[PDB]
């Protein structure tokens, strides 16, 4: 019964051996193939990668102020790791929405995806329309309806919600085990309040990439061998998504390998 | 070096095989799976099917009809298969715009994906934005901010342009080898006036399903011996895309095994 972290270092061998070298925005040096996916399961398990140690608590405060659709940078850096633009978060509860600054009352602005997206569940299971996106603030004064960075469909049957995850870009030494982590996370959370069962992530890749400084770092890190993925814990029950707080959060079982720096 | 339909194939015996019953917009049965991904070469052949005969004209003039940019039905009954409301072409060419007729001057207006699609790619070929995407009529008016059906990322390295589709569901045995051939074509079509040469097609897929009154098709479709791909040929030199006509196209190599009716 094999392990899906096997999928990310088979990935990363691929833009290895058959990668070629491509120049992102910065002119910087990457290896980079494109299209690529990836399967892991949700049930009984959790794709915290083991081959490194991730940072799981930066992964959900990370998440839960997405959740808590917000622009303020302190309102994290004192939760783990003064305006900060529209990121995800704020997309996510109100795109459409006139941006003052963080601290105004957007309540009832734009369209709140996310809380469209759990109702769509509850409603119509069968949807095919299931589907939050979200941009790049860079590219959002850039031009005239720029294209979202990522978007998931999320997807049920048989009493089991899903979510496929499409980046045009993946960071795949940094960023990548972490948005893993991230869709993860949140499926198990949307799972939870639609009382449903988490069941596969998928995770599609448009510009795969590494960048040069992180194929040594990466070599290694192919060298282990990944223990298996751990368990994650609701404690509480939750009904409305912006009531999950961290305390609601176990992982278990969680053996890392050491942690991997990359720069 | 293996055959690319032979993925296509693969993909209906698993959906087929490990496949799960589910319902449609209509309350119509399909087997369905979530997430997959098939990668197709456009170097020296082309993907139309063999294990059935591809209706190619009707793919060609039905691409060239969207790339005109229009809405209107009679502009294609009669090159192949009165309003329209604005399907795919309309939005490629204008989204954002404000629709009045098909016989209107919207010359300037909206955003022209399209263009702005093969612009990018002379400006800045490393970039991880190349992206038109594309609605189903039916969502228009339903709600506020519809989410696409479809997204091509386009994608350019050592002279070779490259696309991915990602459907947010996939008829596989009716529409998946039509828009197989049509992106594929899209491509072609973008690499010639762009002078780049075409690299992979990657198709990825939300919701795969099957009809349930296309499993007996598909059965023995499955049991057919693919041939190999033909070819495409361009035989005008064309600079702007809205030039192209079907005189332009040649299909080359192509001996499908017999047409294969679903209903």
Known sequence: ???????????????????????????????????????????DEFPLLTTKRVFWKGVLEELLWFIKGST?????????????GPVYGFQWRHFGAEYRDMESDYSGQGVDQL??????IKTNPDDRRIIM?????????????????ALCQFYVVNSELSCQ?????????????????????????????????????????????????????????????PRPFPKLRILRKVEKIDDFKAEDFQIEGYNPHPTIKME
Chains 1, 2 share one sequence.
């Open 115 to 120: 809380q469209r997206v759990i109702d769509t």
């Open 72 to 84: 303020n940078a302190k309102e994290l850096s004192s939760k783990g790791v003064g305006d900060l």
């Open 1 to 43: 019964p094999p392990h899906g972290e096997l999928q990310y270092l088979g990935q990363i061998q691929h833009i290895l051996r058959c990668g070629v070298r491509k120049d992102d925005r910065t002119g910087t040096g990457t290896l980079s193939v494109f299209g690529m996916q990836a399967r892991y399961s949700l049930r």
């Open 165 to 225: 995850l499409y980046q045009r870009s993946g960071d795949m030494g940094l960023g990548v085990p972490f948005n893993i982590a991230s869709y993860a996370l949140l499926t198990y959370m949307i799972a939870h309040i639609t009382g449903l069962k988490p069941g596969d992530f998928i995770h599609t890749l448009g510009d795969a990439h590494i960048y040069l400084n992180h194929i040594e770092p990466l070599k290694i890190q192919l060298q282990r061998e």
């Open 133 to 149: 996106c979200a941009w790049n603030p860079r590219d959002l004064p850039l031009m005239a309806l720029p294209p979202c960075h």
